[PDB]
Amino acid sequence: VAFGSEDIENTLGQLDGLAFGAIQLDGDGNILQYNAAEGDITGRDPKQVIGKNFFKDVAPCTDSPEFYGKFKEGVASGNLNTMFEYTFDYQMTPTKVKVHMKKALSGDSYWVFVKRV
Amino acid sequence: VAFGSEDIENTLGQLDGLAFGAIQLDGDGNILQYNAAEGDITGRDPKQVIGKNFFKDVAPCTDSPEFYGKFKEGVASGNLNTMFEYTFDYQMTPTKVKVHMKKALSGDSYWVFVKRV
Ligand SMILES: [Cl-]
Ligand SMILES: [Cl-]
Ligand SMILES: [Cl-]
Ligand SMILES: [Cl-]
Ligand SMILES: [Cl-]
Ligand SMILES: [Cl-]
């Protein structure tokens, strides 16, 4: 599975097999899944972040119109398929990434994919 | 495949599917393979490091009796299966890892497996 691929939500244990970070959020922004690659990139513990809020608890630098604001618009409208660059920084070393956020096929969850730039 | 597993060299595209860093070295310490997870952990570019020396070029903090010295003894003797903690630092943010070094099944290459502590 390639980062950014048009069919990524269709294709999506095995989550840890992805070569890039993958976080599954619900519409409230709480973490349902968080793979090994995302812990590799950020130093956050995949076990500790499940059930926490991505935008308000785990990665508060993302609580901005440029990231959380896009997520909330996407959840409200059902239209979410966006790539952009961002810097993660909270309680970690500042790390520049490329982010792809996309609504899941079910419409009940939302994916955040991450790779280092 | 679990980090540290007794049969890891037997089990070892697919390399990027591993949930932890994996580097294949030859007996001279030059890099033959370097997976996505190791780039995720360190910020080093998996494309750029192939054919470079791990101990002298890519990760010179490892040029120590505690890491390179164990590698050289392992290559010389054929006996290499060791776990230890280490900090990577060269041209990156200091990152504490657990390392497992093990001779490959063929005896012509040597694996370095890495996870964040
Ligand atoms: Cl809010
Ligand atoms: Cl952050
Ligand atoms: Cl994260
Ligand atoms: Cl280093
Ligand atoms: Cl490395
Ligand atoms: Cl030397």
Residue numbers in the entry:
A (entry chain B), B (entry chain A): 4 to 15, 21 to 125
Source paper text:
PYP is a highly soluble globular protein from the PAS domain superfamily. Apo-PYP, as expressed in cells, forms a covalent complex with the chromophore, p-coumaric acid (pCA), a process that is analogous to covalent drug binding. While not a drug target in the conventional sense, it shares chemical characteristics with common covalent drug targets, especially those with reactive cysteines. Utilizing this spectrometer, we employed photoactive yellow protein (PYP) and its covalently attached chromophore p-coumaric acid (pCA) as a representative framework for many cysteine-based covalent inhibitors.
Each nitrile-containing PYP variant was previously characterized in the holo-form (covalently attached to pCA) via X-ray crystallography to high-resolution (<1.2 Å), where the nitriles adopt a single, well-defined orientation at each site. The absence of the chromophore and nitrile labels did not result in any major conformational changes in the protein structure, except for a lack of density in the disordered loop region (residues 16–20), which is located more than 20 Å from the chromophore pocket. However, when apo-PYP nitrile frequencies were compared to previous measurements conducted on the purified holo-PYP (with pCA covalently attached), significant differences in peak frequency were noted for variants F92oCNF and F96oCNF. 24 The current simulations in the absence of the chromophore significantly favor decreased hydrogen bonding of the nitrile to T90 in apo-F92oCNF, consistent with the IR measurements showing a blue shift upon chromophore incorporation. In the case of F92oCNF, chromophore incorporation appears to increase its potential to form a hydrogen bond with T90, whereas in the apo state, it remains largely isolated from such interactions. Structurally, the crystallographic data seem to suggest a slight reorientation of F96 toward the empty chromophore pocket and slight increase in hydrogen bonding population. Additionally, AMOEBA simulations reveal a small increase in hydrogen-bonded population (nitrile-to-solvent) for the apo-F96oCNF variant upon pCA binding. However, the small but definite change in solvent hydrogen bonding to the nitrile in F96oCNF presents a reasonable explanation for the smaller blue shift undergone by the nitrile upon pCA binding.
